[PDB]
Design a protein around this ligand. Structure first.
Ligand SMILES: COc1cccc(C(=O)N2CCN3C[C@@H](c4ccc(Cl)cc4)CC[C@@H]3C2)c1Br
Length: 289
C-alpha cells in the first residue's frame, strides 16, 4: 500500500493519481442536495488543503460542492517537499481534478479559489482555458514578488546558483509576516502538514516562472474575479493586485484592499477575516443565484 509522507495508506483517504503516477491527497465538502456549482480550492506554497476548512464549509453552506487537493510536494500528497519539475505540473493537476469533477457533475459551473502561489495557479488555469470557468476568487495571489527579494542582481545570482546547487535552501519564510494574528502564526508554526524548511533555489526559480507566466497570461484572462489584497503583504506584493486589475481583460473584476493587513487574509485579525468571508460569500452568491 502506497502511503502519504506521514505514513497513512492512501486507501484510507480520498485521493487521485496524477499524470506522473503520483498520489495527491484530496478533500471534499459537498452539500446534502444537488450542488449549484463546483469550486476548486488552490492552496499556496508550503501549506495544504486542510487550511481551508472554514472557508470551504462556508462555500458548501451556499450549496457549492467544494473540492481540493494538496499540490504535489505538499501536505499529504507525494513528491519531494516543495519542489516541482516545472510550475505547469500544478496547473495540469488542477485541470485533471476539475475534468474529473465536471464529468461527474455535467453542466455545473466551476469556480476557482486560490491564495498565494495557489492564486497564480488559478490564474494560469483560467488563462489556459478561457471561458471554461465561471469565476475566480483570489486571496493575495502571487502576481508580483516582493521587489526587494526579486532584484535583477539577485534573480541572476539565483539562476547561477540553480545551475550548480538546485537543492540549496535559503532561510525559511518569516512566518510572523503571514498574519498580524499571532494565534494564527502559532497554528501555522505547529501544523505538521506545513513545510517550514527553507525555500530551495530550484523552487524559487519555479515561483519566478509563475510570476513571468502570470504576466503573459493577464491579457488572456477574461474570467470574472474577486481580488482581495492586504496593503502590507511582504510575500505577494500589493502592486501585483493593482497590475492584475489593470491588465486582465475581464469585464467583471473587483479589488478590495485591506489596509495594514498581511498576507493570509482569511487568517488575519478577526475584523479582516470576517470581512473576507463575507465578501467571498456575497460575490459567489451573486454569481450562483
Ligand atoms: C512557505 O513558503 C511560502 C509562503 C507564503 C508565500 C510564498 C510565496 O509564494 N512567495 C514568497 C517568496 N517569493 C520569493 C520570490 C523570489 C524567488 C527567487 C528570487 Cl532569486 C527572488 C525572489 C518569488 C515569489 C515568491 C512568492 C512562499 Br514560497
Amino acid at each position: 500500500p502506497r502511503r502519504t509522507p506521514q505514513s497513512i495508506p492512501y486507501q484510507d483517504l480520498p485521493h487521485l493519481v496524477n499524470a506522473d503516477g503520483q498520489y495527491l491527497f484530496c478533500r471534499y465538502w459537498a452539500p446534502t442536495g444537488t450542488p449549484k456549482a463546483l469550486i476548486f480550492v488552490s492552496h499556496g506554497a508550503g501549506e495544504h488543503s486542510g487550511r481551508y476548512e472554514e472557508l470551504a464549509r462556508m462555500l458548501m453552506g451556499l450549496d457549492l460542492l467544494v473540492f481540493a487537493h494538496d499540490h504535489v510536494g505538499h501536505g499529504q500528497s507525494e513528491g519531494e517537499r516543495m519542489v516541482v519539475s516545472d510550475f505547469h505540473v500544478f496547473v495540469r493537476d488542477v485541470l485533471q481534478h476539475v475534468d474529473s469533477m465536471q464529468k461527474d457533475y455535467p453542466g455545473l459551473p466551476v469556480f476557482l479559489l486560490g491564495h498565494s502561489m495557489g492564486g497564480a495557479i488559478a490564474i494560469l488555469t483560467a488563462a489556459e482555458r478561457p471561458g471554461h470557468f465561471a469565476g475566480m476568487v483570489l486571496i493575495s495571489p502571487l502576481v508580483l514578488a516582493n521587489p526587494e527579494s526579486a532584484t535583477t542582481f539577485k534573480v541572476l545570482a539565483a539562476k547561477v546558483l540553480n545551475s550548480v546547487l538546485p537543492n540549496l535552501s535559503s532561510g525559511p519564510i518569516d512566518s510572523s509576516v503571514l498574519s498580524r494574528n499571532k494565534t494564527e502564526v502559532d497554528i501555522y508554526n505547529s501544523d505538521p502538514l506545513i513545510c517550514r524548511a527553507g525555500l530551495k533555489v530550484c523552487f524559487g526559480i519555479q515561483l519566478l516562472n509563475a510570476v513571468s507566466r502570470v504576466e503573459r497570461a493577464l491579457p488572456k484572462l477574461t474570467v470574472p474575479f474577486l481580488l482581495l489584497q492586504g496593503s502590507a503583504d511582504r510575500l505577494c506584493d500589493s502592486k501585483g493586485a493593482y497590475l492584475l486589475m489593470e491588465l486582465a481583460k475581464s469585464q467583471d473584476k473587483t479589488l478590495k484592499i485591506y489596509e495594514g493587513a498581511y498576507h493570509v487574509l482569511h487568517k488575519e485579525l478577526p475584523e479582516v477575516t470576517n470581512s473576507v468571508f463575507h465578501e467571498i460569500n456575497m460575490w459567489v452568491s451573486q454569481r450562483t443565484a
